[PDB]
Amino acid sequence: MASLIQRIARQASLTFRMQPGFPENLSKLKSLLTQLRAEDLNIAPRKATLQPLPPNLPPVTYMHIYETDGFSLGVFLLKSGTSIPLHDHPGMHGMLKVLYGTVRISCMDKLPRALPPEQQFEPPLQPREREAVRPGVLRSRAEYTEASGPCILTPHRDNLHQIDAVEGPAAFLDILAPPYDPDDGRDCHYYRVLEPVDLPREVWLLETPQADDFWCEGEPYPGPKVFP
Amino acid sequence: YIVKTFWLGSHRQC
Ligand SMILES: [Co+2]
């Protein structure tokens, strides 16, 4: 009777309210996301324009569906050739389900050891950046479509990720638990992975401001609404 | 401008 997106929201609320019952609830939530299709959200797949992106439009947009104190639920829509740059989710669980298109998701974690003095990167770092670089581990980098299962991240594993739209636009549904809360110490930090002068392998990470060419704007969510 | 969002934290929305 209830729409699939309402059932997902309900199950997310039960799951994220590890306490007893959490794994069975998380498994049921993943099984619901595995069934989700773009049409269940009234989102038609978007295909490439083959035109350059003008400076006034954002590379990525976001449709909000619902949020509680326990989780946030929405859809990111990436235009051709865009990314959500490498970022973390402090103390946070996250799920992602591709709705259309193909994304490449690179998954890493922060490992603190000092950079060895002889160590060298290309492009070279400024002195303040050499002091700030920290070790990380690159755990996976694979492509996902709507036929893949959901991708999961936790506070302790795969907590850093980068999402690239592959050969055209792509969109995914995300669940984040708890949501970000900058006033409470849970913000979104961006990072650069540095190339010195396969998986899992050790890398070097540099926290960095949000890129000048990345931002995300809201757009209306067209699908069935989540009701209290 | 900076907006505090549930989905991307402190986000520069421009
Ligand atoms: Co993320």
PDB file of C-alpha atoms and ligand atoms in Angstrom:
ATOM      1  CA  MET A   1       0.000   0.000   0.000  1.00  0.00           C
ATOM      2  CA  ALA A   2       2.740   2.478   0.963  1.00  0.00           C
ATOM      3  CA  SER A   3       5.082   3.714  -1.756  1.00  0.00           C
ATOM      4  CA  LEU A   4       8.554   2.212  -1.821  1.00  0.00           C
ATOM      5  CA  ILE A   5      10.134   5.554  -0.923  1.00  0.00           C
ATOM      6  CA  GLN A   6       7.868   5.828   2.140  1.00  0.00           C
ATOM      7  CA  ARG A   7       8.805   2.262   3.110  1.00  0.00           C
ATOM      8  CA  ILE A   8      12.500   3.145   2.751  1.00  0.00           C
ATOM      9  CA  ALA A   9      12.074   6.219   4.965  1.00  0.00           C
ATOM     10  CA  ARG A  10      10.209   4.166   7.572  1.00  0.00           C
ATOM     11  CA  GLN A  11      12.881   1.470   7.562  1.00  0.00           C
ATOM     12  CA  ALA A  12      15.651   4.077   7.774  1.00  0.00           C
ATOM     13  CA  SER A  13      13.927   5.497  10.858  1.00  0.00           C
ATOM     14  CA  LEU A  14      13.797   2.052  12.475  1.00  0.00           C
ATOM     15  CA  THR A  15      17.436   1.368  11.571  1.00  0.00           C
ATOM     16  CA  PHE A  16      19.045   4.627  12.661  1.00  0.00           C
ATOM     17  CA  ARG A  17      16.696   5.837  15.502  1.00  0.00           C
ATOM     18  CA  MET A  18      25.839  -1.184  17.341  1.00  0.00           C
ATOM     19  CA  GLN A  19      22.674  -1.625  19.390  1.00  0.00           C
ATOM     20  CA  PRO A  20      20.740  -4.920  19.183  1.00  0.00           C
ATOM     21  CA  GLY A  21      18.587  -5.229  16.080  1.00  0.00           C
ATOM     22  CA  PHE A  22      20.750  -2.874  14.016  1.00  0.00           C
ATOM     23  CA  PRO A  23      22.228  -5.453  11.575  1.00  0.00           C
ATOM     24  CA  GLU A  24      18.890  -7.064  10.701  1.00  0.00           C
ATOM     25  CA  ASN A  25      17.336  -3.626  10.178  1.00  0.00           C
ATOM     26  CA  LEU A  26      20.260  -2.409   8.098  1.00  0.00           C
ATOM     27  CA  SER A  27      20.012  -5.546   5.959  1.00  0.00           C
ATOM     28  CA  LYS A  28      16.294  -4.966   5.388  1.00  0.00           C
ATOM     29  CA  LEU A  29      17.031  -1.344   4.453  1.00  0.00           C
ATOM     30  CA  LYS A  30      19.634  -2.426   1.897  1.00  0.00           C
ATOM     31  CA  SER A  31      17.164  -4.915   0.434  1.00  0.00           C
ATOM     32  CA  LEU A  32      14.600  -2.142   0.013  1.00  0.00           C
ATOM     33  CA  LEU A  33      17.140   0.117  -1.682  1.00  0.00           C
ATOM     34  CA  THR A  34      18.160  -2.700  -3.990  1.00  0.00           C
ATOM     35  CA  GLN A  35      14.599  -2.684  -5.366  1.00  0.00           C
ATOM     36  CA  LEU A  36      14.415   1.086  -5.848  1.00  0.00           C
ATOM     37  CA  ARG A  37      14.276   2.420  -9.405  1.00  0.00           C
ATOM     38  CA  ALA A  38      14.333   5.984 -10.731  1.00  0.00           C
ATOM     39  CA  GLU A  39      10.697   5.665 -11.797  1.00  0.00           C
ATOM     40  CA  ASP A  40       9.712   5.019  -8.151  1.00  0.00           C
ATOM     41  CA  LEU A  41      10.808   8.613  -7.518  1.00  0.00           C
ATOM     42  CA  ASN A  42       9.247  10.068 -10.703  1.00  0.00           C
ATOM     43  CA  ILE A  43      12.774  10.943 -11.882  1.00  0.00           C
ATOM     44  CA  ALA A  44      13.380  10.458 -15.558  1.00  0.00           C
ATOM     45  CA  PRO A  45      16.950   9.495 -16.511  1.00  0.00           C
ATOM     46  CA  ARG A  46      18.928  12.479 -17.749  1.00  0.00           C
ATOM     47  CA  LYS A  47      21.223  12.127 -20.737  1.00  0.00           C
ATOM     48  CA  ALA A  48      24.136  14.273 -21.842  1.00  0.00           C
ATOM     49  CA  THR A  49      23.626  17.645 -23.524  1.00  0.00           C
ATOM     50  CA  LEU A  50      26.949  17.528 -25.439  1.00  0.00           C
ATOM     51  CA  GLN A  51      27.189  21.248 -24.682  1.00  0.00           C
ATOM     52  CA  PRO A  52      29.635  22.919 -22.260  1.00  0.00           C
ATOM     53  CA  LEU A  53      28.303  23.766 -18.806  1.00  0.00           C
ATOM     54  CA  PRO A  54      27.794  27.572 -18.489  1.00  0.00           C
ATOM     55  CA  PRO A  55      29.486  29.269 -15.518  1.00  0.00           C
ATOM     56  CA  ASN A  56      26.209  30.126 -13.792  1.00  0.00           C
ATOM     57  CA  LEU A  57      24.866  26.616 -13.484  1.00  0.00           C
ATOM     58  CA  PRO A  58      25.966  24.209 -10.740  1.00  0.00           C
ATOM     59  CA  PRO A  59      27.639  20.923 -11.714  1.00  0.00           C
ATOM     60  CA  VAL A  60      25.457  18.969  -9.256  1.00  0.00           C
ATOM     61  CA  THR A  61      21.928  19.390  -7.888  1.00  0.00           C
ATOM     62  CA  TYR A  62      20.116  17.838  -4.928  1.00  0.00           C
ATOM     63  CA  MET A  63      16.512  16.808  -4.285  1.00  0.00           C
ATOM     64  CA  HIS A  64      15.602  16.628  -0.623  1.00  0.00           C
ATOM     65  CA  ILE A  65      13.140  13.896   0.310  1.00  0.00           C
ATOM     66  CA  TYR A  66      13.156  13.755   4.109  1.00  0.00           C
ATOM     67  CA  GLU A  67      15.216  14.165   7.243  1.00  0.00           C
ATOM     68  CA  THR A  68      14.784  13.300  10.905  1.00  0.00           C
ATOM     69  CA  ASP A  69      17.222  13.579  13.779  1.00  0.00           C
ATOM     70  CA  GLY A  70      18.445  10.116  12.761  1.00  0.00           C
ATOM     71  CA  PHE A  71      18.925  10.302   8.989  1.00  0.00           C
ATOM     72  CA  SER A  72      18.696  12.433   5.856  1.00  0.00           C
ATOM     73  CA  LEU A  73      17.320  11.074   2.572  1.00  0.00           C
ATOM     74  CA  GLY A  74      17.638  12.636  -0.881  1.00  0.00           C
ATOM     75  CA  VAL A  75      18.955  12.367  -4.440  1.00  0.00           C
ATOM     76  CA  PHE A  76      22.098  13.844  -5.993  1.00  0.00           C
ATOM     77  CA  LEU A  77      22.042  14.495  -9.741  1.00  0.00           C
ATOM     78  CA  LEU A  78      25.446  14.832 -11.411  1.00  0.00           C
ATOM     79  CA  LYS A  79      25.825  16.435 -14.816  1.00  0.00           C
ATOM     80  CA  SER A  80      28.189  14.980 -17.437  1.00  0.00           C
ATOM     81  CA  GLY A  81      31.821  15.023 -16.391  1.00  0.00           C
ATOM     82  CA  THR A  82      31.130  16.244 -12.851  1.00  0.00           C
ATOM     83  CA  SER A  83      32.051  14.812  -9.476  1.00  0.00           C
ATOM     84  CA  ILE A  84      31.314  15.127  -5.821  1.00  0.00           C
ATOM     85  CA  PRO A  85      34.931  15.606  -4.694  1.00  0.00           C
ATOM     86  CA  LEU A  86      36.596  13.451  -2.054  1.00  0.00           C
ATOM     87  CA  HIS A  87      35.042  14.144   1.355  1.00  0.00           C
ATOM     88  CA  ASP A  88      34.403  12.513   4.735  1.00  0.00           C
ATOM     89  CA  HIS A  89      31.377  11.705   6.915  1.00  0.00           C
ATOM     90  CA  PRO A  90      32.515  12.107  10.526  1.00  0.00           C
ATOM     91  CA  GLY A  91      30.833   9.664  12.890  1.00  0.00           C
ATOM     92  CA  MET A  92      28.282   8.899  10.231  1.00  0.00           C
ATOM     93  CA  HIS A  93      26.829   5.956   8.297  1.00  0.00           C
ATOM     94  CA  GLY A  94      25.899   6.384   4.637  1.00  0.00           C
ATOM     95  CA  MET A  95      24.177   4.425   1.911  1.00  0.00           C
ATOM     96  CA  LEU A  96      24.061   5.150  -1.803  1.00  0.00           C
ATOM     97  CA  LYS A  97      21.931   3.608  -4.572  1.00  0.00           C
ATOM     98  CA  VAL A  98      22.480   4.550  -8.219  1.00  0.00           C
ATOM     99  CA  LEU A  99      19.261   5.529 -10.025  1.00  0.00           C
ATOM    100  CA  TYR A 100      20.582   6.075 -13.557  1.00  0.00           C
ATOM    101  CA  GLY A 101      23.918   6.428 -15.251  1.00  0.00           C
ATOM    102  CA  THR A 102      27.266   5.140 -14.028  1.00  0.00           C
ATOM    103  CA  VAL A 103      29.352   6.491 -11.159  1.00  0.00           C
ATOM    104  CA  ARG A 104      32.901   5.703 -10.113  1.00  0.00           C
ATOM    105  CA  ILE A 105      33.190   5.626  -6.328  1.00  0.00           C
ATOM    106  CA  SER A 106      36.659   5.779  -4.776  1.00  0.00           C
ATOM    107  CA  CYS A 107      36.643   4.699  -1.119  1.00  0.00           C
ATOM    108  CA  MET A 108      39.322   5.591   1.425  1.00  0.00           C
ATOM    109  CA  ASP A 109      40.001   6.101   5.106  1.00  0.00           C
ATOM    110  CA  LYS A 110      42.319   8.217   7.191  1.00  0.00           C
ATOM    111  CA  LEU A 111      44.843   6.097   9.048  1.00  0.00           C
ATOM    112  CA  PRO A 112      49.232  10.342  13.159  1.00  0.00           C
ATOM    113  CA  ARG A 113      52.432   9.675  11.201  1.00  0.00           C
ATOM    114  CA  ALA A 114      54.428  12.593   9.853  1.00  0.00           C
ATOM    115  CA  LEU A 115      55.322  12.915   6.202  1.00  0.00           C
ATOM    116  CA  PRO A 116      58.908  11.612   5.741  1.00  0.00           C
ATOM    117  CA  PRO A 117      61.183  14.574   5.041  1.00  0.00           C
ATOM    118  CA  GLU A 118      62.380  13.326   1.634  1.00  0.00           C
ATOM    119  CA  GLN A 119      58.807  12.736   0.427  1.00  0.00           C
ATOM    120  CA  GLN A 120      57.868  14.601  -2.752  1.00  0.00           C
ATOM    121  CA  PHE A 121      54.570  15.153  -4.615  1.00  0.00           C
ATOM    122  CA  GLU A 122      53.591  16.405  -8.078  1.00  0.00           C
ATOM    123  CA  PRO A 123      52.421  19.162  -8.196  1.00  0.00           C
ATOM    124  CA  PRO A 124      54.637  20.150  -5.284  1.00  0.00           C
ATOM    125  CA  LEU A 125      53.107  21.263  -1.988  1.00  0.00           C
ATOM    126  CA  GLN A 126      53.514  24.514  -0.100  1.00  0.00           C
ATOM    127  CA  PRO A 127      55.260  24.238   3.301  1.00  0.00           C
ATOM    128  CA  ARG A 128      52.010  24.599   5.225  1.00  0.00           C
ATOM    129  CA  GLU A 129      50.538  21.764   3.148  1.00  0.00           C
ATOM    130  CA  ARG A 130      53.539  19.510   3.800  1.00  0.00           C
ATOM    131  CA  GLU A 131      52.885  19.958   7.513  1.00  0.00           C
ATOM    132  CA  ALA A 132      49.197  19.090   7.133  1.00  0.00           C
ATOM    133  CA  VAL A 133      49.350  15.973   4.956  1.00  0.00           C
ATOM    134  CA  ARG A 134      48.203  12.792   6.705  1.00  0.00           C
ATOM    135  CA  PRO A 135      48.344   9.092   5.782  1.00  0.00           C
ATOM    136  CA  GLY A 136      45.324   7.320   4.359  1.00  0.00           C
ATOM    137  CA  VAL A 137      44.385   4.005   2.788  1.00  0.00           C
ATOM    138  CA  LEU A 138      42.724   3.686  -0.611  1.00  0.00           C
ATOM    139  CA  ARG A 139      40.392   0.694  -0.312  1.00  0.00           C
ATOM    140  CA  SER A 140      38.474   0.471  -3.606  1.00  0.00           C
ATOM    141  CA  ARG A 141      37.610   2.256  -6.828  1.00  0.00           C
ATOM    142  CA  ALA A 142      34.853   0.669  -8.904  1.00  0.00           C
ATOM    143  CA  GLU A 143      31.957   1.644 -11.151  1.00  0.00           C
ATOM    144  CA  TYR A 144      28.335   1.257 -10.043  1.00  0.00           C
ATOM    145  CA  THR A 145      25.019   1.342 -11.938  1.00  0.00           C
ATOM    146  CA  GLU A 146      21.365   0.904 -10.986  1.00  0.00           C
ATOM    147  CA  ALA A 147      22.011  -2.848 -11.211  1.00  0.00           C
ATOM    148  CA  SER A 148      24.645  -2.707  -8.491  1.00  0.00           C
ATOM    149  CA  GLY A 149      23.578  -3.001  -4.895  1.00  0.00           C
ATOM    150  CA  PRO A 150      23.725  -0.080  -2.498  1.00  0.00           C
ATOM    151  CA  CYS A 151      27.115   1.158  -1.366  1.00  0.00           C
ATOM    152  CA  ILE A 152      27.619   1.521   2.375  1.00  0.00           C
ATOM    153  CA  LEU A 153      30.030   3.602   4.416  1.00  0.00           C
ATOM    154  CA  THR A 154      30.485   3.712   8.179  1.00  0.00           C
ATOM    155  CA  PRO A 155      32.274   5.916  10.711  1.00  0.00           C
ATOM    156  CA  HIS A 156      35.315   3.627  10.623  1.00  0.00           C
ATOM    157  CA  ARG A 157      35.517   2.241   7.070  1.00  0.00           C
ATOM    158  CA  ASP A 158      35.187   3.756   3.583  1.00  0.00           C
ATOM    159  CA  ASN A 159      34.393   6.992   5.396  1.00  0.00           C
ATOM    160  CA  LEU A 160      36.036   9.111   2.681  1.00  0.00           C
ATOM    161  CA  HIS A 161      34.659   8.858  -0.828  1.00  0.00           C
ATOM    162  CA  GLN A 162      34.661  10.577  -4.206  1.00  0.00           C
ATOM    163  CA  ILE A 163      31.845  10.090  -6.722  1.00  0.00           C
ATOM    164  CA  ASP A 164      32.483  10.699 -10.445  1.00  0.00           C
ATOM    165  CA  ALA A 165      29.817  10.641 -13.162  1.00  0.00           C
ATOM    166  CA  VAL A 166      31.062   8.184 -15.826  1.00  0.00           C
ATOM    167  CA  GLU A 167      30.289   8.740 -19.546  1.00  0.00           C
ATOM    168  CA  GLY A 168      27.368  11.043 -18.921  1.00  0.00           C
ATOM    169  CA  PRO A 169      24.999  12.254 -16.210  1.00  0.00           C
ATOM    170  CA  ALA A 170      24.182  10.067 -13.239  1.00  0.00           C
ATOM    171  CA  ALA A 171      22.046  10.231 -10.141  1.00  0.00           C
ATOM    172  CA  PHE A 172      21.865   8.370  -6.850  1.00  0.00           C
ATOM    173  CA  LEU A 173      19.727   8.194  -3.737  1.00  0.00           C
ATOM    174  CA  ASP A 174      21.671   8.796  -0.529  1.00  0.00           C
ATOM    175  CA  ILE A 175      20.878   8.043   3.091  1.00  0.00           C
ATOM    176  CA  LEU A 176      23.097   9.664   5.701  1.00  0.00           C
ATOM    177  CA  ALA A 177      22.846   8.781   9.387  1.00  0.00           C
ATOM    178  CA  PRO A 178      22.991  10.990  11.374  1.00  0.00           C
ATOM    179  CA  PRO A 179      22.876  13.965   8.973  1.00  0.00           C
ATOM    180  CA  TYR A 180      25.724  16.432   8.950  1.00  0.00           C
ATOM    181  CA  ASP A 181      25.499  18.950  11.793  1.00  0.00           C
ATOM    182  CA  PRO A 182      28.199  21.634  11.621  1.00  0.00           C
ATOM    183  CA  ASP A 183      27.088  23.214  14.890  1.00  0.00           C
ATOM    184  CA  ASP A 184      27.605  19.841  16.640  1.00  0.00           C
ATOM    185  CA  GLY A 185      31.029  18.964  15.222  1.00  0.00           C
ATOM    186  CA  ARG A 186      29.861  16.880  12.238  1.00  0.00           C
ATOM    187  CA  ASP A 187      30.879  18.763   9.105  1.00  0.00           C
ATOM    188  CA  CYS A 188      31.828  17.743   5.581  1.00  0.00           C
ATOM    189  CA  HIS A 189      35.590  18.059   4.979  1.00  0.00           C
ATOM    190  CA  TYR A 190      37.137  17.779   1.505  1.00  0.00           C
ATOM    191  CA  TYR A 191      40.480  16.163   0.730  1.00  0.00           C
ATOM    192  CA  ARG A 192      43.070  15.801  -2.010  1.00  0.00           C
ATOM    193  CA  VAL A 193      44.801  12.457  -2.569  1.00  0.00           C
ATOM    194  CA  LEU A 194      48.439  13.189  -3.360  1.00  0.00           C
ATOM    195  CA  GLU A 195      50.610  11.600  -6.045  1.00  0.00           C
ATOM    196  CA  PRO A 196      54.210  11.016  -4.839  1.00  0.00           C
ATOM    197  CA  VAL A 197      57.358  11.381  -6.919  1.00  0.00           C
ATOM    198  CA  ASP A 198      47.087  -2.160  -6.255  1.00  0.00           C
ATOM    199  CA  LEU A 199      44.307  -2.069  -3.719  1.00  0.00           C
ATOM    200  CA  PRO A 200      44.269  -1.613  -0.803  1.00  0.00           C
ATOM    201  CA  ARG A 201      47.272   0.750  -0.843  1.00  0.00           C
ATOM    202  CA  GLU A 202      48.532   3.593   1.325  1.00  0.00           C
ATOM    203  CA  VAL A 203      48.044   7.162   0.085  1.00  0.00           C
ATOM    204  CA  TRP A 204      48.570  10.675   1.415  1.00  0.00           C
ATOM    205  CA  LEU A 205      45.633  12.976   2.119  1.00  0.00           C
ATOM    206  CA  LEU A 206      45.445  16.755   2.377  1.00  0.00           C
ATOM    207  CA  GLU A 207      42.359  18.478   3.724  1.00  0.00           C
ATOM    208  CA  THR A 208      41.358  21.265   1.366  1.00  0.00           C
ATOM    209  CA  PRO A 209      38.584  23.863   0.994  1.00  0.00           C
ATOM    210  CA  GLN A 210      35.570  23.059  -1.139  1.00  0.00           C
ATOM    211  CA  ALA A 211      36.738  23.312  -4.755  1.00  0.00           C
ATOM    212  CA  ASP A 212      35.899  26.513  -6.620  1.00  0.00           C
ATOM    213  CA  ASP A 213      34.277  24.557  -9.445  1.00  0.00           C
ATOM    214  CA  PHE A 214      32.128  22.356  -7.173  1.00  0.00           C
ATOM    215  CA  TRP A 215      28.846  23.368  -5.634  1.00  0.00           C
ATOM    216  CA  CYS A 216      25.393  21.868  -5.377  1.00  0.00           C
ATOM    217  CA  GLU A 217      22.000  23.606  -5.657  1.00  0.00           C
ATOM    218  CA  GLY A 218      18.596  22.256  -4.674  1.00  0.00           C
ATOM    219  CA  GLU A 219      15.900  21.368  -7.169  1.00  0.00           C
ATOM    220  CA  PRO A 220      12.351  20.131  -6.551  1.00  0.00           C
ATOM    221  CA  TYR A 221      11.784  16.470  -5.715  1.00  0.00           C
ATOM    222  CA  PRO A 222       9.020  15.146  -8.041  1.00  0.00           C
ATOM    223  CA  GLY A 223       8.240  11.787  -6.444  1.00  0.00           C
ATOM    224  CA  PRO A 224       5.853  10.469  -3.819  1.00  0.00           C
ATOM    225  CA  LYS A 225       6.273  12.352  -0.582  1.00  0.00           C
ATOM    226  CA  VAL A 226       7.301  10.949   2.769  1.00  0.00           C
ATOM    227  CA  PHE A 227       4.606  11.665   5.363  1.00  0.00           C
ATOM    228  CA  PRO A 228       4.925  11.646   9.195  1.00  0.00           C
TER     229      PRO A 228
ATOM    230  CA  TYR B   1      27.378  32.058   0.404  1.00  0.00           C
ATOM    231  CA  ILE B   2      27.581  29.369   3.117  1.00  0.00           C
ATOM    232  CA  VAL B   3      24.553  27.233   3.995  1.00  0.00           C
ATOM    233  CA  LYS B   4      24.452  24.598   6.719  1.00  0.00           C
ATOM    234  CA  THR B   5      22.921  21.557   5.006  1.00  0.00           C
ATOM    235  CA  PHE B   6      21.953  18.104   6.228  1.00  0.00           C
ATOM    236  CA  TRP B   7      23.441  16.499   3.129  1.00  0.00           C
ATOM    237  CA  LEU B   8      26.759  18.292   2.587  1.00  0.00           C
ATOM    238  CA  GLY B   9      27.409  20.071   5.883  1.00  0.00           C
ATOM    239  CA  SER B  10      28.693  23.653   5.670  1.00  0.00           C
ATOM    240  CA  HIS B  11      28.324  24.111   1.926  1.00  0.00           C
ATOM    241  CA  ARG B  12      29.388  27.032  -0.277  1.00  0.00           C
ATOM    242  CA  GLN B  13      26.348  27.188  -2.549  1.00  0.00           C
ATOM    243  CA  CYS B  14      27.893  29.193  -5.358  1.00  0.00           C
TER     244      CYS B  14
HETATM  245 CO    CO C   1      29.339  11.495   0.718  1.00  0.00          CO
END
